[PDB]
């Protein structure tokens, strides 16, 4: 169908019971629920051929499902752990394995929600040197301090997004690895013509879409409650 | 007990060669199988499928794949490797009358050509008034690979390639940083094995 998932993205404290919902409009018997991981693919929990038909894939343990109608099927994190966390993507099927998959919920399972925090963000100029000795100009964009590893960086030239000269790191370092909640650090690059650079006319930015708390979470701390947001740096392009 | 097998996580091709993506399966009757290609934050797209039909399996962009029941395998080729080409690919197959299972996915990575290679290690500033900086280590050739720094207080990212549309111009480039003050451009990349001709500008 037109399948679609709900939420897109949550992030979640240990202990909870979290529901993500697949509803289609095509009316297909045949609904499964899946989560993606680095280097095992796409795993089936749970499945459904109709109203109250429920059968368990391969790592069907620590979730429930229920099958409320043709058209939605419903999965269940009981009491959600951190190795929960994962790409959650709903599908579909017709009688000839014609799958539709839903968009995904990216979900985060964390313990303790007083070490989630927004990045820190910094865009660093080319150097006179690149520019002297290539005719480009490389901007090094760096994201730092945040947790969990759940953000979207872009960047954006004269206020629109761009995708050409752009390198991001496929996934974040840890600021200190022997930590099982380390705080996360990520780069990208953006490389323009010398002479595009030189012009001070032109805006860079790069943007970082960090998601965290929503208003409804409790916050004891007098740092900034680190709610989902938006964090930028710019530079501006210059001759001298 | 049916299953779907692909071999190596990451696999490197040369832009221009030959993309050949592995899948075998263990069924004894031969299954349904699909090839399926994912982006970056994106979702799963079908490239192609067999379902009995013809042997040779066509699909978008050049792709195609040849069930073999004698070899038991369904391997991905492309005839060419572009740069768009760098995503995960997932070869799957039916089981049980019911649903498909996936294997457990590889990576394309594409080996810019990159002709004219100029290696050097930059030092940039922050926009803003402190004196932070990184190091950028850029424009070397597929030969050179950067290694894990072997100090905790020095961090280095991994090689990432962009593709300049504006000058038709790839390029290969890490990151490095520490918040040691001490710390220089000069010896950030010392535990990679780097060009001879490496550029330090001073």
């Known amino acids: 169908a037109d399948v679609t998932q709900t939420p897109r993205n949550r992030i979640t404290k240990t202990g909870k019971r979290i529901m993500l919902e697949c509803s289609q409009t095509?009316?297909?018997?045949?609904m499964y629920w899946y989560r993606q991981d680095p280097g095992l693919g796409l795993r089936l929990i749970y499945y459904?051929?109709?109203?109250?038909?429920?059968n368990k894939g391969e790592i069907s343990d620590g979730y429930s499902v229920s099958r409320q109608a043709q058209a939605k099927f419903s999965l269940s994190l009981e009491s959600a752990i951190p190795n929960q966390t994962a790409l959650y993507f709903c599908?579909?099927?017709?009688?000839?394995?014609?799958?539709?998959f839903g968009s995904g919920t990216r979900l985060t399972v964390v313990e303790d929600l007083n070490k989630v925090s927004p990045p820190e963000v910094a865009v660093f100029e080319p150097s006179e040197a690149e520019i002297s000795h290539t005719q480009k100009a490389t901007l090094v964009c760096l994201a730092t301090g945040f947790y969990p590893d759940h953000v979207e960086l872009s960047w954006w030239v004269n206020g629109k997004e761009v995708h050409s000269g752009v390198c991001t790191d496929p996934q974040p370092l840890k600021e200190q690895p022997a930590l099982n909640d380390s705080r996360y650090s990520l780069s990208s690059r953006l490389r323009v013509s010398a002479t595009f650079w030189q012009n001070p006319r032109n805006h860079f930015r790069c943007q970082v879409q960090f998601y965290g708390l929503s208003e409804n979470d409790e916050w004891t701390q007098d740092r900034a409650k680190p709610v989902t947001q938006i964090v930028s740096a710019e530079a501006w392009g210059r001759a001298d | 007990a049916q299953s779907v097998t692909q071999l190596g996580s990451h696999v490197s091709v040369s832009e221009g060669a030959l993309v050949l993506l592995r899948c075998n399966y263990s069924?004894?009757?031969?299954?349904?199988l699909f090839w399926y290609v994912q982006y970056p934050n994106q979702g799963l797209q079908l490239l192609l499928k067999?379902?009995?039909?013809?042997?040779l399996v066509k699909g978008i962009n050049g792709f195609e794949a040849e069930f073999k029941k004698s070899e038991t395998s369904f391997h991905l080729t492309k005839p060419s490797a572009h740069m768009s080409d760098a995503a995960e690919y997932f070869c799957?197959?039916?089981?049980?009358?019911?649903?498909?299972?996936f294997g457990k996915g590889t990576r394309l990575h594409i080996l810019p050509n990159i002709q004219n290679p100029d290696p050097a290690v930059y030092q940039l500033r922050d926009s803003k008034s402190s004196d932070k900086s990184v190091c950028l280590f850029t424009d070397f050739d597929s030969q050179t690979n950067v290694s894990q720094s072997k100090d905790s207080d020095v961090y280095i990212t991994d090689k990432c390639v962009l593709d300049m549309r504006s000058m038709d111009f790839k390029s290969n480039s890490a990151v490095a940083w520490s918040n040691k003050s001490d710390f220089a451009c000069a010896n950030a990349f010392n535990n990679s094995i780097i060009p001879e001709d490496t550029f330090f500008p001073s």
């Open positions: 799957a197959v039916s089981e049980q009358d019911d649903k498909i299972i």
């Open positions: 459904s051929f109709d109203v109250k038909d429920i």
């Open positions: 067999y379902t009995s039909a013809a042997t």
């Open positions: 095509k009316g297909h018997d045949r």
């Open positions: 599908a579909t099927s017709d009688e000839s394995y014609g799958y539709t």
């Open positions: 069924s004894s009757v031969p299954p349904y």
